[PDB]
Amino acid sequence: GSKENMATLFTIWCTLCDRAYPSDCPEHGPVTFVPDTPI
Ligand SMILES: [Zn+2]
């Protein structure tokens, strides 16, 4: 994106995978939102 400084080895943090990838997640793809429902 445009917020990856220093630790810019990975671009897209797949929260579903608890890790980021050098590209989109090979399963979940890009991450548009976090599935964290507040209650
Ligand atoms: Zn994933």
Curated annotation (Swiss-Prot):
Expressed in many tissues. Highly expressed in ovary, testis, pancreas, brain, heart and prostate. It comes from Homo sapiens. Signal peptide: none annotated. Coiled coil: none annotated. Belongs to the class V-like SAM-binding methyltransferase superfamily. This is PR domain zinc finger protein 4. May function as a transcription factor involved in cell differentiation. It is found in: Nucleus. The gene is PRDM4. It comes from the Eukaryota.
